[PDB]
Design an enzyme around this catalytic site. Sequence first.
Site, PDB file in Angstrom:
ATOM      1  N   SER A 173      50.898  31.495 -24.105  1.00 31.86           N
ATOM      2  CA  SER A 173      51.644  30.320 -23.632  1.00 31.86           C
ATOM      3  C   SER A 173      53.051  30.358 -24.212  1.00 31.86           C
ATOM      4  CB  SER A 173      50.853  29.057 -23.961  1.00 31.86           C
ATOM      5  OG  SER A 173      51.230  27.964 -23.136  1.00 31.86           O
TER       6      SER A 173
ATOM      7  N   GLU B 167      44.815  28.589 -14.334  1.00 32.40           N
ATOM      8  CA  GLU B 167      45.844  28.220 -15.301  1.00 32.40           C
ATOM      9  C   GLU B 167      46.195  26.737 -15.242  1.00 32.40           C
ATOM     10  OE1 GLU B 167      47.463  29.730 -17.690  1.00 32.40           O
ATOM     11  OE2 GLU B 167      46.711  31.784 -17.491  1.00 32.40           O
TER      12      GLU B 167
ATOM     13  N   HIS C 241      43.351  27.310 -19.086  1.00 33.58           N
ATOM     14  CA  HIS C 241      44.401  27.817 -19.961  1.00 33.58           C
ATOM     15  C   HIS C 241      43.930  27.879 -21.408  1.00 33.58           C
ATOM     16  CE1 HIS C 241      48.620  28.559 -21.059  1.00 33.58           C
ATOM     17  NE2 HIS C 241      48.451  27.699 -22.047  1.00 33.58           N
TER      18      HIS C 241
END
Lengths: 530, 532
Positions: free
Chosen positions: A201, A327, A440
């Site tokens: 990330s 995601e 995610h």
Amino acid sequence: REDAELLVTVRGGRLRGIRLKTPGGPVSAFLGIPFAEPPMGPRRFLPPEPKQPWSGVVDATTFQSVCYQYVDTLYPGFEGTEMWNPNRELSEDCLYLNVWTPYPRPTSPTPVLVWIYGGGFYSGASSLDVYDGRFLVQAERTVLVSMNYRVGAFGFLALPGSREAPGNVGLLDQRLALQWVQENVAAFGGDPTSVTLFGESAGAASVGMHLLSPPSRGLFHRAVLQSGAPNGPWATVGMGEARRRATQLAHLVGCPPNDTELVACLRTRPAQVLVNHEWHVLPQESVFRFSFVPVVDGDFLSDTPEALINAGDFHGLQVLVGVVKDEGSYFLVYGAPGFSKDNESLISRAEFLAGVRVGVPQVSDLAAEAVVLHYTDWLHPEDPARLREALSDVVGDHNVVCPVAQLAGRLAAQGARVYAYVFEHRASTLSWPLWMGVPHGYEIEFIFGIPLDPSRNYTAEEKIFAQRLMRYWANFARTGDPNEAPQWPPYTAGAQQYVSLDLRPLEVRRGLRAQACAFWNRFLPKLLSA
Amino acid sequence: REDAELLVTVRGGRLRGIRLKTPGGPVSAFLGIPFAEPPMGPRRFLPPEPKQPWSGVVDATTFQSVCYQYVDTLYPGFEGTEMWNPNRELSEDCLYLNVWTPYPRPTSPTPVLVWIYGGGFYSGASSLDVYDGRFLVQAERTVLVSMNYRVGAFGFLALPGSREAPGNVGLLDQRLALQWVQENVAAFGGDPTSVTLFGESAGAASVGMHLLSPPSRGLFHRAVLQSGAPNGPWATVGMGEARRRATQLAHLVGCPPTGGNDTELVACLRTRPAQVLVNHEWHVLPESVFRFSFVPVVDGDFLSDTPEALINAGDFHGLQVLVGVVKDEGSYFLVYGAPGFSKDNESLISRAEFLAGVRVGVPQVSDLAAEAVVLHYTDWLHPEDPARLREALSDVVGDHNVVCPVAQLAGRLAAQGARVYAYVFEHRASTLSWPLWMGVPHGYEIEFIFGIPLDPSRNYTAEEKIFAQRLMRYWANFARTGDPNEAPQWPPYTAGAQQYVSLDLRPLEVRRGLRAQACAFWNRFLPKLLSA
Ligand SMILES: *[C@@H]1O[C@H](CO[C@@H]2O[C@@H](C)[C@@H](O)[C@@H](O)[C@@H]2O)[C@@H](O[C@@H]2O[C@H](CO)[C@@H](O)[C@H](O)[C@H]2NC(C)=O)[C@H](O)[C@H]1NC(C)=O
Ligand SMILES: *[C@@H]1O[C@H](CO)[C@@H](O[C@@H]2O[C@H](CO)[C@@H](O)[C@H](O)[C@H]2NC(C)=O)[C@H](O)[C@H]1NC(C)=O
Ligand SMILES: NC(=O)c1cc[n+](COC[n+]2ccccc2/C=N/O)cc1
Ligand SMILES: NC(=O)c1cc[n+](COC[n+]2ccccc2/C=N/O)cc1
Ligand SMILES: *[C@@H]1O[C@H](CO)[C@@H](O)[C@H](O)[C@H]1NC(C)=O
């Protein structure tokens, strides 16, 4: 008496570590090594200064303080949110890094992996259970380094042009720790000529920014970007908007309204006060759009990441990039109307159109209607299950998948050897609801071999799977190629090949959502400028 | 002496027709009935005058002249192009209509089908073999009427505001014929309370403009739109652009000897030989395919607003419409200028030819709009595959010009009160002369609706004759009852379900959505883009 394997001397002085247990054998750990002077008082907002030498033995047997950050409270006590929350006391005195090595310490140079945590540039810590390096180090005989870097206003408040708040100092913390690795990792058995950055990330975006900043590029040799990219819409801010945001935080905490005087006032406020007003400086109220992120001021980033990617010669670079299957799902529960981990989040058309402006903030209405055109199925424009999946796509495509695919395609066409993956295994221990798919951040625990922790409830195949991923990552660190059996081909701009990562053997596929990412990467830019 | 079945009195006087043989028995045809004063000399560019009455008997025994028009020369001698070219001498004296009626004449009033030919408003004729009404009348016992109407500059050159060339006279020609049908179709056994307009391409666009023009809307009761809509990007033009094109044509032929006085300008045009105007017609354009020089003008009179404004503002309760498209609407147009295309090879184009074809097939949109078109129609896993590029350019061209305008019209009529039926025609004729890569091209459903395969001198196979008989029944059922049905059922089209039927040798198959994804781009997004 003393175990010699746990005493190390570095430039600044002597260290004492701790022997750790893994189901595969012991591991040496040196935790809470100071690599910078504590950025307190007058050093707040300033670039990090190297740690001055000490006498005696620094106790490096336990994790150090977490840098000051906001705490997620959306589901208090829920495993899926608390696992990212600070697990040590908050402090501005937080610039410490950790080193895991095999036991006994290697006596020939060992490949080094450096982990940069994510957290939207406003949160994170190197001490989280899911970043425990003991499994990778034992299983794959690497040296693992992770550092804390200042997040939030403490790392990324910028009054561009000022010397009292120049910006990007959280990135300079990372670079200083990378410098520390060059000067000292050999004392642990690590090879400073074989350093692979990896991050997830905002940590993956950090890695990308080190790739695009020449002073950093000489400090490592490979890069791994997991579910993040320096070209993501959330990852950088312009100089003017950065100054507006910094000035707005000053006003919100009782500070005028001269850069020197405003920073001086800011340095008098307790750190928790800056945290408490952090979220209330953004232009619109939405999920995403973090307040203090890297600023493009022509110094650390001489241009925008997108511009630097397009203009770059990337021969001699190997990168590993990838995404999880879903995601966008995790972000929706933080403010997309109608979403909750505790219900099936079967939203309505109106909630869907509302979620688009929340998930794609910062765009004209013509841009937003272009989004709803593209993500509406016009044979089923109001199906609630389809609208849930489509907004997850909108949010994941715009913020993670398509920036990663743009980075991958540009780096490959311009000299880099790129390997791309999609992580498609839903953890048997996963606490988030099934409608979120593979959300995610959920590949990390497998990359770090957490399923090998005997006190956790992963299956036997999930342990085999984790050992496969650790081998892929270590193989890439050692050689720039994850392969050792069905083979993982490089990603190219034309063929666009990647592999799915799950309990099944590798399956090669084509296109990182090519149709959707053509919209975000090729058309939507032209619409916004003209 | 005389056959009583071939004699009819209408308002203007007496007519004598002919008894035509058909594969299924006799039909009475009255071909070449004058319905307007010849628009010659001083009446060029003027609205049509109703035909003055006559003494004696007018012989309505053959097709009259084709209105002056440009003649396609792309593939000389090729049936695929020559079948649309004029089959009578060209004349400005061309305002005649045709009536086919059963033999003997119906005793009880019979529903009427009125055909309006296409041809991009610059070409066409009611006398084309493929428009022969004898088979429809024979097979389904209807009265069929078709009329000639002025095309090109003679029908649609507009100096808006002026009285000497007010524009849209070609549409007024059609309206005059519709009025003639109301006053006179009963004399042939027809029912003036059951008049179904049907037309194709520009004919379908013409049919739609009569729906959206109140003076015309009282002259019919049902409509059929085949591969055309009034809201198509090619079907109308603004007053300023109409005046610019008219002035450029006049300038190209020496008028005035620059516009100035409109009366002075038209009077100079009226001294030019008709062929001269035709020969300079295509020079007036900014070039591409598709965009036609002289088309209906939105000027507040015949069309009080743009067709898409009128379509949205419309209350369409009590209206039944039948609309549809062929399977591959865009392929036929590409051989008329799209780079790399030919009927005589595979037209496997490059990506640069695809990009250049987009500008030609979607002319007069901004570069941003063209970028959006290339984004949508590019397969980004196969961006340079020549075969996929060929089909994609056909989709671009067909969706933009035909499919999506018709789909927008279908959904707005259904949502605003009309009963709508929708089809996709998917049979490639065994007699088709076009290459295989074109699929089922624009205009090649017409021969089947007119029962042309029943002609013994043609080599259609036997299922195709059955197929033609099925479609003629659907069309006549719709004209009679406003519903083409009489197992399996053809459901109405709705804005939500968007159901339509496929028309080929197989039985009816119901499907959802007239390229719903693609048309959402043309009808919902792209207008917002072009208003920014
Ligand atoms: C397919 O043909 C087109 C058009 O060329 C015509 O048709 C050919 C089959 C052949 O009969 C030619 O003699 C005709 O002129 C080709 O496109 C043309 O290519 C030429 C160069 O060779 C160029 O000068 C023209 O401007 C082009 N015209 C158009 C309409 O594009 C096309 O390259 C051919 N593709 C093939 C061979 O598959
Ligand atoms: C343009 O020219 C025409 C024809 O000369 C003008 O129409 C005539 O105008 C005169 C007066 O100047 C009248 O006596 C005639 O009866 C008109 N004849 C017609 C209507 O054809 C027209 O007025 C002129 N318009 C201008 C000057 O723009
Ligand atoms: N506004 C919030 O409560 C908030 C806080 C933190 N995050 C992100 O932190 C979670 N996280 C942080 C780092 C890496 C992964 C992850 C989650 N993956 O699912 C989102 C919202
Ligand atoms: N010479 C030309 O450019 C040209 C192009 C197209 N048309 C249209 O005429 C053909 N046509 C006319 C009426 C109805 C259908 C069709 C075509 N069907 O495929 C005429 C001239
Ligand atoms: C594993 O599951 C058991 C229940 O079967 C539970 O008591 C325990 O806390 C869980 N431990 C982990 C590591 O999740």
